[PDB]
Every structure is written in structure tokens, then in C-alpha cells.
């Protein structure tokens, strides 16, 4: 069993010396080519990807000076003025505020906020919690003012909840402010850290997004221009503006570029219907004890809020990843064989030379396929009982008859035409189905007796047994001996077994000579004359002839 | 070279003619382009995915009604009362609060917080920190209260850490609070951006699993009972509840979707251990002056923050993964070949008709596949000088000696039986080891003398030189000529040449009739009988025999 | 067109009997195998991996004990004295302060902070924002003490922007402060959470990279230790500093690992330039009215802000990605046919036998290569009606001309040689270019006349037609009566047909005997000489001979 280990096997090729088939196949192999390493660079697919993670640090730096009241009041704003302590993913700027001073719990009307107007009590609901005047309904309708009703709240009074945001924006000017993005990204299956300000930067720059678009200081007026937003408009109500960073970075050290790219997208809907909270702001609120009662401030802040978004991904250089590529790509180059072998398999059908052929003459040298098919194909059948062959001297083809012989005589019975070998020439140099007047009815049992009811034609004529082919091929003694000798060169020529041995390579030797293929002589059916003239030239003493045997 | 370039390859091939292989081939093909399909569908692998990149905006609404104190004080808390600024990816809700009002950093003793009794000065320990505490210990035990001592401690006084949260919570109405949820996603790498509130939605709706499973609006009551949390429970100690927010997007026109999902789950552990802070709570102060020193009040609130979860993947058609996952995919389509290639190599074996085929008679049609094999594999050996075939006369097979002759005749030395072929009947149509009393001693020296040390049998009996074949073939000087001048059309039959040349003729006729294949013709090893016999028909005038040579 | 549909194509090998070529397979397969075996666990291709979503809960402990003040004050800062309330994936300990009690919005002098001396008006610009000194200049030098002189300032006064931070750092002591980090993560792909404290943990533990790896309690000195910063500096100015939680979780139940690995990375530069806002710190307002005024004090806290950077992803078996990887890997495992293919075709070369032998006799006993080529491979031309085959008795070779004859004689045209066939020995078994004295000039058109101008040889000699051999095969009317009966058993011997028939036959004969492979006798060119010796043979009684036709 050890030499069957030691094996290797090998295609059988057929190499065509053709000028468009090797063209063909040298540009579909170039074209696959070019496209998988098109493929693998544009898309860095030799590359394990991995996100970052980030840390941001922010610092917004500016002074507002404004005119608040009635009296004129100059007044500044600085960062503890206007920013929350947080300096991270998210940084606030207050552009607007509203502040209610000294509220106490207690009763008082609602603010008339756009059809909070009311006509009498019936409209209001005591015990009602209103979400929007932050306060509980007591059921009652009193005077707001002198002219316009609301109705009574308990709450913090004096309510002024669904006050309009001032116009303009008291801290407008913050679009004059600047902020400085200090931002750490790693990738830590690469073990790779970089941060977005480096040794040698400019620290009196600006970003731009062409003369300055490394420098991390932004003016917020220029954020929102970049991508056409009024900060004038959206200081009054607020906002959320977003700031992307993203990171492509190519970790390869002979392609190492990691550099953050800068960009501005409003994150809040500018057209926010007005009962869903419209712009940005928040209630902060003071408490503290005034003439001895329990006392709150509150401020509702309106600004913007900046969120920084960090994403991206490192890629180094992965051999498993270029593996798997390669892998994947690999069946990609028998495309140029499927394609020629279609070619070679669709032209050398029939159906060209009869009908695509003379309605277009440019396609017929293509007619060469044949030639082709028949170096590469050989068609065989399977080998079932039923399989038989037939030849009629009159026809220049082969019948096959894979069908049983329901009590119809075989030379009745139609079969599947199929054509003759090449025949090597290099080793070259009164039954009424007869026809042949020289057949004889068989032997075997009724059972399977159709099978030798056979003819040497189809039609009529001189039987193949008088031509001296046969006689010299299948009753030569001389011949049949002498092909037995080749076989069997110590053969004894006595005995029964020789007729035998005679009478079998009389079959085969008329069997390859009407067939040619031993695939097609194997189950060849020998017509009834030729069978018992063979017969009585070497007959069995004593016995019954078996016929036909299946061979498998 | 050109010529070289123009070149193509097709394999040959045998096609069968099989219902069961042909109905095999076709199933398997079937079965592996359903599974890719669906493997293709399900898993989306024609699209490149992108993880989003996203902004939330939150809102609380809702307004507690509180009865506090002894005395009934009734109060509300609006959404100052209990929430922070920050309007993130988290907001907290406060639903329990203890105030320590008007806080002086001097001695006190320590809160008798479930085990802290102290017993005697023995048990505190001077200039020891306590983090529970949150002050410094100075070793001496002082009564608390009437009943308990604790131990003394520099820190802000009174010292209240340690007393437990209110129960019922004070603000466990906030159940009934809604926080209305604004998430804004964008995908860079896709250009996609959209919102999970577009126009027409309902302003009034609230959120649930089946009727409104895309309203935004959530009441915090609602989603700590969609996972069956206890809102009021939580609320004394407060926790941490995960609002997820799922994007699963198809950017493709004709299939495009991008919705968000919603689903809860509580992040903070409910059976945290004591000493591991369990709940959610954090330390609040608000410093002041008063009397003429620096106060402070604390509260701790506790509370539930809520924790806004998003998260997903855009996937967008895109040409290179889909070409990725067919070039994958493309090598599981000769399964098919594979497996009927394997079924004709395994039933060509002879283990088969011998043992498998008796025990049972239904794999025994499947001896077509010894047919099969014959036309599909062709057997060579590798060419080496070692390599020999012998053939008996006695015997009906062929032996194959590769193995070395050291001193033993070649008679005598065993090889492996090898089968002989079919012989292309349409072509056709004293030494001691010596058997048959015609072989001589070799005239090679004795190195390489062993090789010529074969008879025509292994048996006594008579000669293979006795049968005519053998005169007709290898001694008739006629037929010798003939094959010649077929070799060579105008060959002189004249001089010392044309002995060698007929005698190498008559070398390779025994060789070609007796082992049928060039293969094993070339390689053949005449018996000493037939040999000499040949010699002594055509002898060499002057020379010695040179014997079989090695033709690689 | 059924039958067409139940059809195995199955592709026709030679299998080698060879050590070295079985060797080099098993051992190319075996390479192949592991490899992608290798890739497969190592980076678990069979899974899908999908990135958690977090949440963090820190809580820090300790309390720092200070000495402020001349006179000597002893005090205490718990939690609420050094931590904002956020308690997420960032949280900040106070480790610095400057504070700046009843600040006024009035004039004042800027803080002198290293270059902002002033030496006269001329320096100072009114009206200018100083986004460092926090206030609008007046242009008015004025004298902040006894020594220096500073620019005049409206802002909040007094201005102590730009004082340096207390060296050394006041809450110091918070080196010795813990952070409890309570860490939940989820994989909602696979439905799979877990968090980074489990039951059964040690309560009273520290982190340590060695003894405690999984203890989530972190002394935040340590911290620093670690990665050799050093935490009583940072406190100074402050600082960023990353704990990195890395989740590397195999979800699969035989290989369950889902585990936190904690790690630590300082975020801010420590060369940051000191333009750039070195450190880390924020301004925080408390704004109250005293004396009738609107009073402010600002608190600048230094410390250090500690990013929780949780990430990683979770691996669970998938079948999709394990049939993808191994069709991408498939097609690796013909490599050890490529090989031994691409030895065998260079081996068969010539340029070896006579150039690589003689210099190198270790790589001569692969010349068995030629044997495995000519077993492998079949060479074959286009048919193509320029291709031309012919034979001259005095060389050994044939000749093709694959090129149209432009009035040239084909016997002057050049040629490609080509190899004659083995023959099957199993089977066997006066014009001027003319230089035999038996050519005639040729009766066809002139048009294409150089085609019949063919002579049996190049040189002067005795003509093929001299052998007895092309009597035999070629005039012999017997043997082609013979074969035309093999093809035509009941032909009549008579009329003007058999004549054409004989004719074509003894062509037929020529060819096959000329060039033995049917490929090349199908376009092969008959000499003159014995194509006339054919035609006195066997005349056309009437009408005009039409030579060779091109078959396809
Ligand atoms: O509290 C204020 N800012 C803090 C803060 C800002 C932003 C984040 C956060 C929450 C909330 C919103 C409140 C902190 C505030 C201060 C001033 C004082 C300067 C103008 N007055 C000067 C006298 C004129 O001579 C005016 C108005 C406000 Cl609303
Ligand atoms: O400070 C309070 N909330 C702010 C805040 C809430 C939450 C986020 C953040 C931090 C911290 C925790 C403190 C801000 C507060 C207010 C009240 C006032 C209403 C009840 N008293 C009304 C009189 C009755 O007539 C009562 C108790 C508290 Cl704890
Ligand atoms: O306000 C303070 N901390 C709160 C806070 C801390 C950090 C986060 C955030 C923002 C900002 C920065 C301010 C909250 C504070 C408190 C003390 C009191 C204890 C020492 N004095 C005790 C008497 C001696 O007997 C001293 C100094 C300060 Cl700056
Ligand atoms: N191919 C073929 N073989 C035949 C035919 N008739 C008989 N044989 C073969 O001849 C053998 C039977 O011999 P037969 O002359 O019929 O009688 P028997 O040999 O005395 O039993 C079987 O092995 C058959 O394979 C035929 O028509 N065609
Ligand atoms: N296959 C085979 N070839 C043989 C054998 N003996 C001789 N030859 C061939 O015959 C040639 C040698 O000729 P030989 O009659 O021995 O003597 P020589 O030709 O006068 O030197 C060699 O080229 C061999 O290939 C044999 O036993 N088997
Ligand atoms: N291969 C080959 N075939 C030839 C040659 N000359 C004639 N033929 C064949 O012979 C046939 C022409 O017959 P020919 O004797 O020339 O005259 P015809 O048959 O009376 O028209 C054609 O079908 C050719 O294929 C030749 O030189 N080489
Ligand atoms: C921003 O600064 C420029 C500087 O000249 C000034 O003209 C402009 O008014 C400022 N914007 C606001 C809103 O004050
Ligand atoms: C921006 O909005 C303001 C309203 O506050 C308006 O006065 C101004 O004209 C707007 N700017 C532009 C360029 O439309
Ligand atoms: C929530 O509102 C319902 C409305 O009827 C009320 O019955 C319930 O008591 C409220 N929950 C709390 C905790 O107050
Ligand atoms: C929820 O917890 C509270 C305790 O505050 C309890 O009274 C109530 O029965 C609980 N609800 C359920 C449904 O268990
Ligand atoms: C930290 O605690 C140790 C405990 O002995 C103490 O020695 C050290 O001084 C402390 N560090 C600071 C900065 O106070
Ligand atoms: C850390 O920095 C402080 C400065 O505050 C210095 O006194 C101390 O020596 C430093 N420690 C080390 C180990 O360098
Ligand atoms: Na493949
Ligand atoms: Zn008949
Ligand atoms: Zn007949
Ligand atoms: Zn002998
Ligand atoms: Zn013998
Ligand atoms: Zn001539
Ligand atoms: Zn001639």
C-alpha cells in the first residue's frame, strides 16, 4: 500500500497553437490582474483595520463686552460666564439667556405663551400638571396683566416660562470666540498613539480649510460659515454644531500618514416643529434664603452646544489578511479556460455549419473547433445491460439501442444514431425482418430470443457474408489462429475449446471490424448471417450456444 | 519564441453518459448556489458596512408634587429641581436626596453607619482616614447621641454620611416624568445622515413595543417595567438604566430602511454589595459665609442616570466585497467533481468485486466504474535504470523488477505483477535458472551480468522459440525489411549496419508482442533464448554484444 | 437534447509512479494545511466579532488632610470638596487652586504673567481684548505695585489671571485617593453582557498589574507609578490621564473568556507649549450681591481629568465566516500541482539535455521529465488553409509552412521542423527545384500552381518511387481495393468512381506513411512525382485534376 502513496496525478492537456485563444487568454489573465491589485491597493485589503479611541480637550477662549439695562450697563463675559466646567467630547457656549430672579413657591398666573390665553375658569383645570408652565393648575383664571387673563399655577413665581428668547442674542459675539481641539487618538491593537498638535506648530494660526487646515484653534463664527449657518440667527434660540475629526491613517512605515481631517455639520434640525424644543438650552437653577423664605434663581441658558466626533481606523500591514485576498482572488484566473473552452465547445456544435454558418460567413473559420473539440472530448456511455449496437451494411452509420427488447425484434426496434471511428488508418496500412435471405431464426429461448433477430441491412440486398472482407477477417482458420497464437503463443490447436476460442474471435474480429471502437464492439450485436455462418464454420459439438453476454 | 506565446491548454476529458452522475452533478451544483445565495441575502455580504457616528439630545418634562416637613409643607420640583445640565448620551433624574445644611469643619463625632459603634478610645485610631466617614479620626470615642458613642472625627460638621436613604423616596413620582429622546446619526463613508424624528410624527404619542414602537417620547415608569424593574424600589437608592438605541440601516434605494429600534436594560448590578456603593448617588455642595465662617450644605442625591445607547451599521452596495465573496465562494463548485470522482476511484478498486460485492448485491452495478477509471487514468512509471519487465510464457501476466541485480539473476529476483494491456485488436485484425533448454550463458562481464540471466519460463517446458509466431515475427528477415524501409522508404539492405539494424528490430518486435505497450517494451528484458536466437539470425561480424541499454 | 442534460464531464490524468513528485505533493498539502490552520485559530476566522457598547461607574474615596492659611488653618477636602458630580467615562480630582474672592466688573491693573510688563501707554491698546488677561485694555499703563506697571483692564477685578498654580500642589495628598470603576459591557449581536466585578470579590483589594490584575479598586498614585509619571508634578498644572479597559471576549461555551484587561496611559503632552494651555484646568463662577453690588468669585481649579477608554470586541462561531474563509483558502491547495506541473514542463526542455547537463551532472537524472510531457501533453496547430506539411526522403524531420506561396515554388519556401510520430510500432508489429528526375510541372492554375511545385527531396538523389515500399502502399491496387472494402464492404469495382476513390486512397496512404499522425497527413503535400506516378496509376478519363483541398 505504500507505492499507492507515492503518487501523483496529472492532467492530460492538448496544447492548440493558436494566435486569438493564446491572445485571449493572455488578456483576460492581465485584465484579472490588474483589477485584483487595483482592488487590493485601493482598498488597502492587505491591511488588518482597527478603530481608534479618543480623548478630546477643549478650550474656548474670549471675552464678550456687552450693554445690558431702564439704564445703560456695560458689563464683560468670560469663559466661567458663559461655559460649563466640562472640556471633553462636548463643550457649551451660552449665547442667550433668560433669568428669573427671586421665585418663590407659590400661586401665581401663567405666562401668556402663544394660546396660553385664557377666557374663564372652565378652560383651566385644577390639579392639572402643565409640563410646559411648570406648574399645577388650580383651576382658575386670573389676570396675568391688564389686558390678557391666564389662568393660576402653583409653581415658582413669578412664572416666566414660555418667554420668548431675546433678540438679538445678548452674548452674539461669541462668534469672535475661538476654541482650541486637543485631541489623543490610539489604536491599541497597533499600539500606536499620535495626538492632532505636533512639535513646531503655528500658535497664532486659525483653521482654514485650505491656508490652515492642520491648525486645531476655530473661530466658531467660521464653523458655522463653512457649511452656511448664521450663528447671528442661531445664538437667540441655540443649537448643537458638531465638529468631526476623522483619522485615515496608514500605519506602514514606508506609507505612514496619520493626520486628522476637519470638518463642521449642524446636528440639530433647523426646522424643529415649535411644541418639540426648538435650538438648545437648558434651566439652571440658584437657591438660596431671602427674608427668611426659601428662594430660587433661574437662568435659562440658550447657546450652542459643539459636539467633537473623533472616528476613523489604523491599517498596518496583515499577512493573514493578504492571504485570505490572494485566496479569494485565486479562482479568478480560470476565467480565460471557462471562456475559450465555451468558445471551443459551443462552435464545433452542428448547428453553425448548417445554419449560422451561411447566413454569416464571417464566423466559419471558426470552424475549426471541431478539430479542437475532437482532441479534447471523448464521449463514452455507460455500460448497462440494455446497451446494444447495430450497423446495417446499407447505412453509413451506428445504431444504439439502450432500450429492452419487449418482444420486438432488435432490427424493428429504433435506436440513437451515432457515428463511426476514424479506423486508424496508420494500423490499416426465410424470416420476415431479413432482408438478406441468408439469416435463420434463433435458438434461444422466447425470453430473450429478440435480441439475435437481427439483419445485416435494413433493405433488401446482397448479405455482407458474400464479400471476401468477411471471409478473410471473421471464417479465416489461418487468421483467428494466428491472432490466438499472438495472444497465446504456446496454444494447442485440438480439443473443443479451440472452436470455442475461434467462434469468439470470429465475433470480435467482425465486431471491431463494423465498429471499430472496443467501447462500441463490446456491446455490438452481430446480425443473424454472420453469427451462424460463423457458427458453422467452428460449431459447438455438443451444447447450446449462450449468445450475447453482458459484459459487466 | 513567439509561436511559444500564442499557445492555449485544454484539458481532455471524458464525458460520461450517466443518469445518476448527471442527476449527482447537477444536485450538488444546486445545493452550493442556494446556500452562497442565501448566504449572500442574509448576511448582506455585497454591502460594505459603517459603523454611524451619533449625537443625542435630551429633554425630561414633568413636575413632582411633595409633601416635606414637624410640619406639612407641600411643594413641587420642576426639572431645575432635579436634573443636571448635561443633555448627552446621559442624564440623570434625582429621585431621593439627604441635605446637610450649614456644614462647619471642626470635631464631631462620626455617623453610627451599621457598624461604626464605637465601644471605648481603643477602637478609633488618631490621624486615621475613614473614607465612609470622610473624615480624620482622632482616637477618642464620644457619645453621639444618649445611647451610642461613635468615634470622633475632624470633618465638615454635623457628619451625616452613612444615614440611609429616605424610603419611601421623596421624588418617586419622577415614574411619571417623560424625557423626550432626539438622536441624530450620519454614516462619514456613506454620506447618510438622518434622524430619528421626521416630519408627521405624532407630537402626543408616548412610547410602547407594539403600538408606537417609533414614537421618542418615553415615561421612565414605562421603561423600568418593559424589563420588570421596580421604578419605586430604584428610586430610594437610586441606578443606572440603558436606553439602546439600534440602528440596523440598508442605504441601497431599492431596499432602503434605516429606523432606529429601542430596547432597555438596567446597567447598574441590583445585588452590588454594600460596601461596593450600591445604586446611584453622588455628593453635591454649595458653599457659603455666614456668622462670620465658611459653611457648607451637602446633598446627597440619589437618583436613576439614564444612559442613551446607540449603536449600528449603514450597509451600501459596493462592487469589491460582492467580487471578495464570489471569488470565496467560486472553488465550492467542483464539489461536484470531487465527489463523483472519488465514488469512480474508490468502486474501480478490486476489494470490490471480491469482498464488498458478495456480502452485498447492491453496489455491485456500480462495476462500471472499472470502465470508467480505464478511460479517465492512465498508469505510467517512472523511467529509472533499474527498471525492467520480465514476461513468462507460463505466466499471463506481466512483472516489473525496479530494483537492482546484486549478483542474483533476474530470473530469480521477484518483481511486482503488473497487468498486460489490450493489444488493440483492431490493429491486430544448461544453465540452472534455465526452463527450457535453449538459453546460453551471458557473454556481459559479470558486473552487469545478471540482467541477461532470464529464461522464457519459470516452469520447465518448452521454449517460446519453438512457437511459429516467433519466426514469423522476430526471425523473418522479410518482415524485419519491410518495417525498415516503412522507417526508411530508401535503406540499403547492404553492409555490417543492416545486421544491427534488424537484430535491434527483431529486439523490439518480442518486445512489442510480448508486452504490447511501448511503455513496458522499452523496457523489457529479453530471455537469453531469444535472444541468442536473434543473434545467430543476424550476428555481429566483429564487436561484442552491448545488451539492454538504459534509453533516459 | 435530455441525454445532453445528464452529462459528467471528468477530465483525463496521468498518474506518475514517482517518490519525489508524491513526496513534494504530500509535503506542499501538508504546508498548505497547517497554514491555514494556523490562521484560522490564531486570529479565529471562524468567528464573527462585533464591538461592545459600555457603561462606567466610578466612585472616588479619600479624604486629604491640608495646612492653608499669616496663620497656621488645618483642614479637610472630602469628595464633594474635589469632584464634579459626573461619574462616567471621565472624572475629575482636584489637585490645584487659585482662588479669587469678590471679584467686581470694574478698571484694574492685568496680573503681570511672564511678559506682560508694561513701560507706558504706548504698549497698551484701548479697546483691545485680552483672551489671557480676561478684560478689555484701556490703553493706560498703570502701576499694579510699587515696581511694575501693567496695562488697565475692564474686567472682573481683582485680575489674578495668569498667577502661577500653587507650588507645591495643595490636594497633593490625593495621590492617595481610590477610584472604584464599575464597568458594564454588552455585545447585543450576540446577546451576551457582562461586567467587570463578578460575586466572590475581594472588597478590601488595590489594583496591581502582577498580584491583583482584576481588583477594579485603583489608587490613583499608583496609577501614575505604573507607567512612570509621576502624580505629586501633575498636580501642580494637572493633567489627562487614560485607564484603558480592553475586553477581549471569546463568547463560544467550550472556550469561554470574556475578561477586562486594565491598562494606563497619560493623555495630555507633557512638552505642551506654554501658549498652548499646559495641564489641565477650568474657571469656575460663584456669582452672589454684597454691598449693594453683583460680586463673583472664581475658583480655578488644577487636577487631573481621568478618561475611562473602554473597548474591544466579542468573538462567538459563526458558519458563514468559517465557509468563507475556507473557500478563500481552497485554492491554495493546488500549489503542489503548479509546481510539479512547472517542473515537469522545464525539464522537458532541450536547453537542458545540451547546455544545463554537460556543465551540472547532478540535475541529469531529471530527464524523466521528457517522458511525463510527451505522456501529458499533446501539441496541435490551428487548421488553417495556408498550413502546409512536407517530407523529403533525404531528412529525418517533417516541415510545415504555415504561409501562403506568392508565386514562390514550395520547394524553395522554408519551413517550421517538426518532429515526426513514433509510427506505433504495435501497429506495424525537368523542372529545377525538382532533383529526382520524376517531377513534372504542375497543370493548375497559376494562381496556385507553387503548391504542386513539390519535390520528394532537397538534394540530388534516386526518388521515393524507386522503393518497393511505394509500390506496396501506394500503386498497389490490391491493398487499396483492400482497404476500401474495410471502409465499404459491398463497393462495386467499376465505373469512373473507383478510379477517384484508388486515387485518394494512395494519397491517403502517401500521407500517413510520410508523416504517421493524421493531424499532419491531412495537410500534407504530396511531391510531384509521385502524385503523378498516382494519377498514371489511376487517370480521370475526363476532366481536371483538382489537388489539395483545404479540409475545414
Ligand atoms: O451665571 C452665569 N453664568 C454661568 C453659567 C453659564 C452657562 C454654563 C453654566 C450654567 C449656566 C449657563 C450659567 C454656567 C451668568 C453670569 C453673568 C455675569 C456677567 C454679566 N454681568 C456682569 C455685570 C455687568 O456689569 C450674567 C448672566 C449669567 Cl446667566
Ligand atoms: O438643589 C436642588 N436641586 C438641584 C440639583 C438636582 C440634582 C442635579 C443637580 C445636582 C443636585 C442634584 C442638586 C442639581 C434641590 C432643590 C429643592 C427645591 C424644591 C423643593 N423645595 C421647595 C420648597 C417647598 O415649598 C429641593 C432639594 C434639592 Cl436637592
Ligand atoms: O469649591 C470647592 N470645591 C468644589 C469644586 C471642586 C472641583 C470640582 C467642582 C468645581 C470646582 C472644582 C469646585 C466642584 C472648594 C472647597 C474648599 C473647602 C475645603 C477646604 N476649606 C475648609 C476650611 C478649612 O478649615 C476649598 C477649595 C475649593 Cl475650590
Ligand atoms: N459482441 C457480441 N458478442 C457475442 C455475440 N454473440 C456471442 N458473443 C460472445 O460469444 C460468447 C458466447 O459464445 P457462443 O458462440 O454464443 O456460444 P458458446 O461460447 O458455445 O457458449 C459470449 O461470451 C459473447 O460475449 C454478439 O452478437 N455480439
Ligand atoms: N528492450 C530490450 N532492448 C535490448 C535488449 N537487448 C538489447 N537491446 C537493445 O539492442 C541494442 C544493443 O544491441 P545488441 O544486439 O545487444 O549489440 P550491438 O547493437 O551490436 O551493440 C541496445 O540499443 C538495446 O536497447 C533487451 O533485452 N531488451
Ligand atoms: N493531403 C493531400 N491530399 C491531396 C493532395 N492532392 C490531392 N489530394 C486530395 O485528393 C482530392 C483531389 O483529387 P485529385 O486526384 O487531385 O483530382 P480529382 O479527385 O479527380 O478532382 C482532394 O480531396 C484532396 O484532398 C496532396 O498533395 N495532399
Ligand atoms: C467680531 O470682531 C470684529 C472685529 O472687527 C467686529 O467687527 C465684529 O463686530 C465682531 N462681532 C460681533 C458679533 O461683535
Ligand atoms: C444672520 O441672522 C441675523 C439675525 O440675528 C441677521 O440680521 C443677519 O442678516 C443674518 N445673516 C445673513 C448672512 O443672512
Ligand atoms: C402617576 O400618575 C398617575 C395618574 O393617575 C397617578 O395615579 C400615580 O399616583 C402617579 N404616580 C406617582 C408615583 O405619583
Ligand atoms: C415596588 O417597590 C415598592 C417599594 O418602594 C413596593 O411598595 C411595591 O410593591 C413594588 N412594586 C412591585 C410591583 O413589586
Ligand atoms: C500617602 O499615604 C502614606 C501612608 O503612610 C503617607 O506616608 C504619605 O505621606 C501619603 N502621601 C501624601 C502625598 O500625603
Ligand atoms: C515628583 O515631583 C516632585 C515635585 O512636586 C518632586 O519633589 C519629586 O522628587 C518627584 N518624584 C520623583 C520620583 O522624581
Ligand atoms: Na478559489
Ligand atoms: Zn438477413
Ligand atoms: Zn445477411
Ligand atoms: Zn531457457
Ligand atoms: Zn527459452
Ligand atoms: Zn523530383
Ligand atoms: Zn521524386
Redesign the interface.
Known sequence: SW?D??????????????????????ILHMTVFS?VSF?LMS?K?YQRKE?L?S?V?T?V???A?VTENTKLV???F????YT?????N?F?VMTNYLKSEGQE?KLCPEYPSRGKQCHSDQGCIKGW???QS???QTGRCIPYDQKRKTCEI???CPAEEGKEAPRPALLRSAENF?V?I?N?I?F?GHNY?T?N?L?GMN?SCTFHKTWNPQCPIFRLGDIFQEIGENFTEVAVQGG?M?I?I?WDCNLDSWSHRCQPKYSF?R???KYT?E???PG?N??????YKENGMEK?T?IK?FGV?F?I?V?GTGGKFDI?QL???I??????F?LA?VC??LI?NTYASTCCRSRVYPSCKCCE?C??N???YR??????????PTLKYVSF?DEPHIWMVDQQLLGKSLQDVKGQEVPRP????????SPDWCQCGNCLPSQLPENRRALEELCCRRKP??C?T?????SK?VLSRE?LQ??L???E??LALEGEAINSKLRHCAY??YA??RF?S?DM?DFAILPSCCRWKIRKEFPKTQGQYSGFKYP?
Open positions: 507505492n502513496v507515492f503518487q501523483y496525478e496529472t492532467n492530460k492537456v492538448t496544447r492548440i497553437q493558436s494566435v486569438n485563444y493564446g491572445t485571449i487568454k493572455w483589477y482592488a482598498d485589503l478603530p479611541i480623548s480637550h478650550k477662549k474670549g471675552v463686552e456695560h458689563g464683560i468670560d469663559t466661567a460666564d460649563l466646567p466640562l472640556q471633553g462636548s457649551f413657591q400638571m402643565d409640563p411648570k406648574g399645577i402653583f409653581a415658582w475661538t482650541l486637543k489623543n490610539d491599541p498613539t495626538r498638535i512639535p500658535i448643537i458638531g468631526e476623522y455639520r446636528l440639530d434640525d416643529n411644541s418639540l424644543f438648545y437648558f434651566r439652571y437653577a440658584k437657591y430660587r433661574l441658558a452646544r459636539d466626533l472616528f493573514i492571504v485570505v485576498y485566496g479569494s482572488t485565486l479562482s479568478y480560470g479556460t475559450i473552452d471551443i473559420p470552424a475549426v471541431e478539430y479542437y482532441k479534447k472530448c471523448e464521449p463514452i456511455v455507460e455500460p448497462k451494411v476514424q479506423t486508424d488508418f496508420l494500423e490499416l496500412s440486398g446482397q455482407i458474400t464479400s471476401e472482407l468477411f477477417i487468421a494466428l491472432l497464437l499472438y495472444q503463443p504456446l470480435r474480429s471491431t471490424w471499430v472496443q464492439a459487466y
